[PDB]
From a paper:
FEM1B is the substrate recognition protein of the oligomeric CRL2FEM1B E3 ubiquitin ligase that has been implicated in sex determination, apoptosis, colon cancer and Alzheimer’s disease.
The asymmetric super-complex is shown in Fig. 1A,B. The asymmetric super-complex consists of three protomers, but only protomer 1 and protomer 2 were well resolved. Protomer 3 was partially obscured and requires a lower contour threshold level to be visible. A single protomer of CRL2FEM1B in the oligomers has a conformation similar to CRL2VHL with the notable exception that FEM1B adopts a different ‘elbow-like’ fold. Protomer 1 within the homo-dimeric CRL2FEM1B super-complex acts as a scaffold stabilizing this auto-inhibited super-assembly. Furthermore, the loop connecting α-helix D and α-helix E of the CUL2 cullin repeat 1 (which was not resolved in the previously reported X-ray crystal structure), appears to bind the C-terminus of FEM1B through hydrophobic interactions mediated mainly by Tyr125 of CUL2 and Cβ-Cε of Lys469, Tyr472, and Cys521 of FEM1B. By using blue native PAGE together with glycerol gradient ultracentrifugation and MP experiment, we obtained evidence indicating that the trimeric CRL2FEM1B disassociates into a dimeric conformation after neddylation.
Residue numbers in the entry:
A (entry chain A): 283 to 522, 525 to 745
B (entry chain R): 23 to 57, 68 to 102
C (entry chain F): 189 to 470
The structure:
């Protein structure tokens, strides 16, 4: 126990071979090495905290592992017991959590891999990318709650894909292939559906354009149109403002809906206007300016083509848009100073009227509003965690049901242990949550406490 | 003068979830008896002409919407 | 009930002849009125919630007041008034519920419809129409470019998810998993493909892909899991004999050229098929 703390390589080899000669020498060495590696890894991971750079949390661990593996290959002959002990020691390091603090490690890994895939990381060669990500999956092997990382990566991948911010679809396809080998196809089925829909959307637009050219009467929409077709099953956009589309887009909407009805019968389309963006051209200024704004922002701008001053009631009636998001959009437009607020009050109220800014000047003729999708809001992560918690609840209920039905008679501890065995890879479950799920399933009459013993449970059906 | 618009389309409750409500076949492939003819209906629902003909002669109702289809 | 303590025959006759009949009549009338009033205004889900609430209240009050013997009859009358009278309305709406489902909502259909004898079998048929049709979407959308991988995972996912839905919700009634097998068996065998037994021969192709050495390959432990999952598909397939005739041909070519990655893998392959069919099949 002392000689491991300050070790001599020749002495280590001698004591190792001598302990291997004897029957019972190994376990003390194994346990003490596990503890020493655990403490060293905890010291290494606790060295840095919240320094705006997440790669260290990965990189340092890599180094430590590498160092140790060299030693285990050099003088320990790579004994599998020592391999397993190193795995056990490294398991705690990544899964370390501060008291009362949730494990941000899956979030950190998701942020890291997303940053690698984002075009913000320029000058980084693809071979080096895949090498770094090969290291990344090795680090990921030690993570317990794969579901949280899955949800976060799904959201980040959707954000990247909808705006075309990825390196190249080959890179993310290689990533999904690597992840599929890592956790099975089920872990990547939704992401594969995502990629498939992304690939198909191009041919969908092509067929739509072909239909446009094939119409009996030539139709001039008056606008340049591009649309993307999304499945409800994989896209994490389940939220549904009674916003009114501007009249200029009504022709395109109706004609595209007719196209989709003719080519894809029985498919009921749904419009996510808050995600739809577009190009607007201001010509009233001294120079023609171009703005990349959302449909809600565009509707407010088009409301001014008929009147230079519009009241809040007029905008709200024309757009049928709720007060909170309408106020947000108006404030965002005021920030660029494309409009001037005609009321002295800083707060926008129902009586607020807005005038067109004929004196607007911009350094760029074509400009964009910075994508807040890259920006992180604390509420979004909490909502994602709540959704993951609900998914865990449902899955644990499922596992309890399957185990109970398969055994047709079982104990409380045996059900708990078999649930633990089934869900250990997917996430870290908790005993109290399992008991809560058991109580809920009892309430819904899936199972009933055995009349011989309340610690035994019997399938009602 | 020039306007460009990028949009997202979301679809659910497809008829191709059930394809033909008459037969156990795809919306584009052949019917049970046939295995040809895509006969669109004013009912906004797509079924094979062989399917809709046979299951309209015996019952004028459309099973999915519980009303008359053409 | 205690007054007739010493009478040897029919001790409870006075109780039933003085109290039980008016109580049953008026409780039936009251719950008829309440069911009519609720159905006049409530929504299907809200009516579903309120009937469960009333049935939960009834057990408590009947335990509080009446004799231990009379719980069952009063509960049966209460059941026969609410759900039984409006059973046809519940069947009508069930179609939309199953095609797009709320976990809580269509779950209570099982609980309510379980009491009435005649209502239940309608639901089990409706599930088969939906589940089989969904599988057709999975199959008919498959591309001819890479067939062997498509069948193995797609139908399993359809099977896996519907297994997930059925047990978490419908209390996994035996009859219901029987509906699972019949619809799934129908899906795997179709006549629409031009080549007859197109799927069974493609199973050998999937096995042929696993018959190859595939040096840059996946772990043999999980390979058996794929085969373990593969057999699940095999049971639903009717033409088992056609598979064996084709399989030996490509197995022979794999064996004669040493295309097989490991001999132990083939031995397990032989072993697994033995419990499936065995005897002459193996
Ligand atoms: Zn048909
Ligand atoms: Zn036909
Ligand atoms: Zn119709």
């Amino acid at each position: 126990h002392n000689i491991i703390r300050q070790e001599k390589k020749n002495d280590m080899a001698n004591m190792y071979v001598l302990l291997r000669a004897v029957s019972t020498g190994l376990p003390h060495m194994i346990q003490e090495l596990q503890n020493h590696i655990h403490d060293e890894g905890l010291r290494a991971t606790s060295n840095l905290t919240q320094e705006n750079m997440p790669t260290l949390f990965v990189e340092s661990v890599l180094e430590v592992h590498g160092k140790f593996v060299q030693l285990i290959n050099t003088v320990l002959n790579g004994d599998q017991h020592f391999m397993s002990a190193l795995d056990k020691a490294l398991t705690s390091v990544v899964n370390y959590r501060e008291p009362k603090s949730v494990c941000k490690a899956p979030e950190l890994l998701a942020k890291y891999c997303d940053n690698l895939l984002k075009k913000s990381a320029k000058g980084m060669t693809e071979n080096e990318v895949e090498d770094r990500l090969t290291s990344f999956i090795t680090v990921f092997k030690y993570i317990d709650d794969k579901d949280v990382f899955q949800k976060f990566y799904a959201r980040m991948l959707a954000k990247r894909l909808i705006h075309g911010l990825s390196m190249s679809m080959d890179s993310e396809e290689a990533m999904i292939n690597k992840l599929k080998q890592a956790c099975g196809y089920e872990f990547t089925s939704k992401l594969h559906r995502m990629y498939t829909d992304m690939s198909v959307s191009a041919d969908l637009n092509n067929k739509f354009n072909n239909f446009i050219k094939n119409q009996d009467t030539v139709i001039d929409l008056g606008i340049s149109f591009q649309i993307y077709v999304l499945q409800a099953g994989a896209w994490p956009l389940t939220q549904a403002s009674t916003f009114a589309i501007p009249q200029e887009l009504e022709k395109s909407v109706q004609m595209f809906e007719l196209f989709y009805s003719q080519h894809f019968s029985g498919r009921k389309l749904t419009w996510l206007h808050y995600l739809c963006t577009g190009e607007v051209k201001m010509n009233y200024l001294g120079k023609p300016y171009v703005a990349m704004v959302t449909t809600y922002q565009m509707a407010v701008l088009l409301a001014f083509n008929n009147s230079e001053t519009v009241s809040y009631k007029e905008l709200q009636d024309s757009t049928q848009m709720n007060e909170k998001e309408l106020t947000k959009t108006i404030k965002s437009l005021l920030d660029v100073k494309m409009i001037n607020h005609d009321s002295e009050k800083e707060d926008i109220d129902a009586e607020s009227s807005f005038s067109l800014n004929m004196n607007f000047s911009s350094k760029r003729t074509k400009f964009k509003i910075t994508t807040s999708m890259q920006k992180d809001t604390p509420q979004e992560m909490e909502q994602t965690r709540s959704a993951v918690d609900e998914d865990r609840k449902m899955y644990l209920q499922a596992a309890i049901v399957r185990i109970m039905k398969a055994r047709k008679v079982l104990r409380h501890n045996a059900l708990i242990q078999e649930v633990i065995s089934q869900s250990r890879a997917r996430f870290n479950p908790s005993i109290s949550m399992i008991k809560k799920c058991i109580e809920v399933l009892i309430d819904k009459q899936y199972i009933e406490r055995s009349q011989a013993s309340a610690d035994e449970y019997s399938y009602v059906a | 003068e020039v306007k460009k618009w990028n949009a997202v389309a979301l679809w659910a409750w497809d008829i191709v979830v059930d394809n033909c409500a008459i037969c156990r076949n795809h919306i584009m492939d052949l019917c049970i008896e046939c295995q040809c003819t895509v006969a669109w209906g004013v009912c906004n629902h797509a079924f094979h002409f062989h399917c809709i003909s046979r299951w309209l002669k015996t019952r004028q109702v459309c099973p999915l919407d519980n009303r008359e289809w053409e | 009930v205690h007054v007739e303590q010493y009478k040897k025959k029919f001790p409870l006759k006075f109780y039933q002849e003085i109290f039980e009949s008016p109580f049953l009549t008026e409780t039936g009338e009251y719950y008829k009125q309440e069911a009519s009033n609720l159905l006049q205004e409530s929504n299907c889900s809200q009516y579903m919630e309120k009937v469960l609430g009333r049935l939960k209240d009834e057990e408590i009050r009947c335990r509080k007041y009446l004799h231990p013997s009379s719980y069952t009859k009063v509960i049966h009358e209460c059941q026969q008034r609410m759900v039984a009278d409006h059973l046809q309305f519940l069947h009508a709406e069930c179609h939309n519920i199953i095609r797009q489902e709320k976990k809580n909502d269509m779950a209570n259909m099982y609980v309510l419809l379980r009491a009435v004898s005649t209502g239940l079998p309608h639901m089990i048929q409706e599930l088969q129409n939906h589940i089989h049709d969904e599988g057709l979407r999975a199959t008919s959308n498959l591309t001819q470019e890479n067939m062997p991988t498509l069948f193995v995972e797609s139908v399993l996912e359809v099977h896996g998810k519907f297994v997930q839905l059925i047990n978490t919700v419908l209390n996994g009634d035996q009859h219901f998993m029987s509906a699972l097998d019949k619809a799934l068996t129908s899906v795997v065998n179709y006549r629409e493909p031009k080549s007859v037994c197109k799927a069974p021969e493609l199973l050998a192709k999937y096995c042929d892909n696993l018959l190859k050495k595939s040096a840059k390959g996946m772990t043999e432990n999980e390979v058996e899991d794929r085969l373990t999952s593969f057999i699940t598909v095999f049971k639903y397939i009717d033409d088992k004999d056609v598979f064996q005739k084709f399989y030996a041909r490509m197995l022979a070519k794999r064996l004669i050229h040493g295309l097989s990655m490991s001999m132990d893998s083939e031995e397990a392959m032989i072993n697994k098929l033995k419990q499936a069919c065995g005897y002459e099949f193996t």
